[PDB]
């Protein structure tokens, strides 16, 4: 019951975190110790109207990134959607989907990932998304529907990985609003790396207690 | 493209069949020669608002079972939902799900059903249903959620098909208003069988042409 997907919202300093077959809209508070939660935890049903009657009502959401404007794709196993998140509001739909990752990227056919994602982010670069499954990474361009480079070792692209519990995977991710910032999480741990695109540069340098940086999760994780 | 799952509507003498991501409403006719499509063939997405943006809206419903007033089991792959079908009206709503067929049916687990079901019929005994997956069938009372008898091959149940192309397994099926008899399908071919619940047949009509049958279906089936 740790962090099993996350997306950062279009407002300032909140992202979206899904546990089970649920979630918490949380302030992070990148800047200061006045993390909070400010809604949740919620089954991801009662939250969300539009996923009520779908595959994420029943059984949550596993992966998801956000994209522009108030749209993130989620995923549950080898399915995907492409949703309105409609943030602090009634108003959340589904767009497109829920389409199989192969009818939604149909480069990813005949690879790992067409089974299902482990973890997402968003990039600062254009349109771009690091994606993870196994000890894998991948990098697209949402837009255009592309794969950008070949699929590589996490540890290709993210040297400063090795030797950690991170380099043979992901549990869930989200960027952060301080640009070239992400989070990563696996488990009870976190990381904070920053990263530049197209670059493989390094930093950091700390895996760390996630109920240490984000105290008003205390109870929440673990979910038993 | 042929028919891939059917349920008998509470209203006499009415069938869903569904094709690809489509239905057809049939009047079929089961004691005159005047058949007709009474709507259709349209998108399950179109004509139930409420499986829109489900995957039974996007890939379409691959076996189904009628239950009790205007309430149909409906299937895709190893997923299900319980839905109110609310014959000639858009109040159509799903009840309960989607579900994986493991959560809704748990004495599946482990056996060849667990990851989708071929095609199935809802019995006259009580809250009975028979469900077809390759050359083996089970009996259910979904009520009680049981498993009637042992799972066995389509020839013991059914000694009027062997020799028959239904002998290794059936696309489609649904149970007719008259007491006792069903259809079943597979290519461009049907049987309409007599059953007993819990005693063999003998002889009854043969396999033909779904066409022959019913010629408001020409132009329709196959999907090209
Ligand atoms: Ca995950
Ligand atoms: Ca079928
Ligand atoms: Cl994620
Ligand atoms: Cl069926
Ligand atoms: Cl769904
Ligand atoms: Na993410
Ligand atoms: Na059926």
Known sequence: GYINAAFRSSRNNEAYLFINDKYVLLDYAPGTSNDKVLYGPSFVRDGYKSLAKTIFG???????????????????????????????????????????IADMFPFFKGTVFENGIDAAF?????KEV???KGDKYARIDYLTNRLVQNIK?????????????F????????????????????????????????????????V?????????????????
Do not use: Q, V
């Open 167 to 206: 380099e043979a995977g992901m549990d869930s991710a989200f960027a952060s609003h301080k640009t070239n910032e992400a989070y990563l999480f696996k488990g009870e741990y976190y990381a904070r790396i920053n990263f530049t695109p197209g670059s493989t540069n390094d930093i950091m340098g700390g």
């Open 208 to 224: 760390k207690k996630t109920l240490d940086y984000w105290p008003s999760l205390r109870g929440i994780i673990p979910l038993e």
């Open 122 to 126: 968003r990039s600062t670069k254009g």
């Open 130 to 132: 690091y994606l993870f």
């Open 58 to 100: 029943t059984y949550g959401i596993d992966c998801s990134f956000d994209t522009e404007y108030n749209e993130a794709f989620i995923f549950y196993e080898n399915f995907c959607a492409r949703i309105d998140y409609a943030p602090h509001s009634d108003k959340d739909k589904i767009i497109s989907g829920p389409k199989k």
């Open 153 to 165: 070792s996490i540890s290709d692209g993210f040297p400063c990985l090795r030797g950690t519990i």
